Design an enzyme around this catalytic site. Sequence first.
Site, PDB file in Angstrom:
ATOM      1  N   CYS A  76      43.645   9.731  66.769  1.00  0.00           N
ATOM      2  CA  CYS A  76      44.183   9.958  68.107  1.00  0.00           C
ATOM      3  C   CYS A  76      43.803   8.863  69.096  1.00  0.00           C
ATOM      4  O   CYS A  76      44.346   7.755  69.043  1.00  0.00           O
ATOM      5  CB  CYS A  76      43.725  11.318  68.640  1.00  0.00           C
ATOM      6  SG  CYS A  76      44.367  12.735  67.724  1.00  0.00           S
ATOM      7  N   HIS A 107      45.244  16.592  62.845  1.00  0.00           N
ATOM      8  CA  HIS A 107      44.028  17.372  63.006  1.00  0.00           C
ATOM      9  C   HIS A 107      43.793  18.200  61.747  1.00  0.00           C
ATOM     10  O   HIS A 107      44.630  18.249  60.841  1.00  0.00           O
ATOM     11  CB  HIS A 107      44.123  18.274  64.243  1.00  0.00           C
ATOM     12  CG  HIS A 107      44.285  17.523  65.531  1.00  0.00           C
ATOM     13  ND1 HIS A 107      45.019  18.012  66.591  1.00  0.00           N
ATOM     14  CD2 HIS A 107      43.810  16.318  65.927  1.00  0.00           C
ATOM     15  CE1 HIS A 107      44.989  17.141  67.584  1.00  0.00           C
ATOM     16  NE2 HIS A 107      44.264  16.104  67.207  1.00  0.00           N
TER      17      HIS A 107
END
Lengths: 243, 397
Positions: A94, A189
């Site tokens: 990210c 994730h």
Amino acid sequence: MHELTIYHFMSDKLNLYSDIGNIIALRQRAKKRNIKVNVVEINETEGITFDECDIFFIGGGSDREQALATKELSKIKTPLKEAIEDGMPGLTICGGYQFLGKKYITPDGTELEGLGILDFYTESKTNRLTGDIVIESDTFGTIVGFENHGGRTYHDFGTLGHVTFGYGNNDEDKKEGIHYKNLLGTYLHGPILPKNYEITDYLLEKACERKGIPFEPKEIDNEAEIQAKQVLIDRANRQKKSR
Amino acid sequence: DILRKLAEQVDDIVFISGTNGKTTTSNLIGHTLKANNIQIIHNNEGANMAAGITSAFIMQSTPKTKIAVIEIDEGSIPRVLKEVTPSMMVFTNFFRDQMDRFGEIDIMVNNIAETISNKGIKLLLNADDPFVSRLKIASDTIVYYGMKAHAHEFEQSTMNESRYCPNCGRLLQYDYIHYNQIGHYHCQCGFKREQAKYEISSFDVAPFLYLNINDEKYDMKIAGDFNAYNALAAYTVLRELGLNEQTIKNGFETYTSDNGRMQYFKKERKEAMINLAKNPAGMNASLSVGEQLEGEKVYVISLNDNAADGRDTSWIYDADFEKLSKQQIEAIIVTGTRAEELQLRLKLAEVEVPIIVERDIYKATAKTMDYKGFTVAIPNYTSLAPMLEQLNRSFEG
Ligand SMILES: [Cl-]
Ligand SMILES: [Zn+2]
């Protein structure tokens, strides 16, 4: 005993996306190959070299913490680039993946300068790209995870693979993450390494070839990882048949 | 009007009041009396005001009910006492809200005292609370309960403010402080921490409450440091009702909660417990309950990814699942819509015990009755409702 050293950059408060599971997954898969993993947490980026580094990891955090990590990482922006250009393996998640380009544009138009290792930018919107994501890759096999990011990354580099369900870097490309040499970045994730053992083994195998140590045995038990992938794959196809 | 006539048919009426601990104390009193085959009238947490208590007497009045155990909101005391007069009344504590008008507790305590003044009511007051002991001016038969100094170290300093004497307005001197205003106070105006009739000498929570009340051990099945005062307040009521130390010991060792928070089950020699965990902090707490339990354990861990739980299960890798290697475990049953995430988490945690995957929460929960060990149930939120229903179904004695 064979040893691989992982440089965990900004371990102190850059840990939103768990990130210890990526370390756990790397250490367990390497343990099955009789490789002891030494994790060196680095928060002082002054005078640190990349000689004893085999893999590096850069997690993600809030927009404020990413700018603080970008300023600290800029103190070694050139020796890090030469390591990546030389083929240093690395995984970024990210914010660590977004802040490798030139800038990051918030929804209000505020530009935050990035590290500039690669030529790409990110444009954020209010509506996030959220949901389960399934990726089909040639190098990393089937990548499964969960995405939730407002930033749209635009780059013309190699990606992690084609997106069969989800969005990826943006609404249109149907491509997720980046794959430039041995450097990896993503929005996934879970974390990403526990289930996607083929990404973990990729980072471990490449580091062994550079160091000159055997990566044996290459094929190990992956049933628990495959059973976790199949749950989201079956769910993605179940919703895909409604669209 | 004509309703008070029901209150005259019952010989003993017990009021439970205070800011915190009303429900736990009221349930402990009622459960011990019901366990002794004593027919009583008892209300619930959702009906402790004027209209709720009035309905409670009508629905439950029988010629057999001799004791009335009802909790009451302290704001409803003046209205209720205009129609009901109880034999004894117990107060747990009074706490000011962080955002409570200056002196809100002092005015409230004075409003209760003028209502309960005279009336010959047996007041069971917490000696460690100064605003509760202020009520000693409203009766002649006062029974004090409290806790000895250094009996336990509470998580404290939540509020470290200075409290005034409810009798003269001076700063209260404290000889020992349990937490906040609860402690051993002594003011030279005469107002002091009075001598306690029933006193807890020591206790611990590992993993349940183990109380030492007047040189007697009580192995209870509820948790929480702050429930020790609520259990002692129930002990004080039951002792004043004629129950000896052994009768209270039987009822206290079998009572438990009914909301899935440290809730206990038992059928013959099979023991089980359930405790919700929805974050890394709660998970590490639920896993630490197993190490404090005797013998082998069998786990059921549920992990749903519904909207109420969130779609990101990343937090399970921040919990300390590696600590399960320090416990004797027959098998670990993983369940929920993300059961395979738990199996992969335990594999990476190097927990080398048999793992069974059963995605159905009902079938996986009932699967623990096949084992002889102590069942530890750890669900997230949306898994609590089906898991708790199955445990109640599997434990019917
Ligand atoms: Cl009315
Ligand atoms: Zn005083």
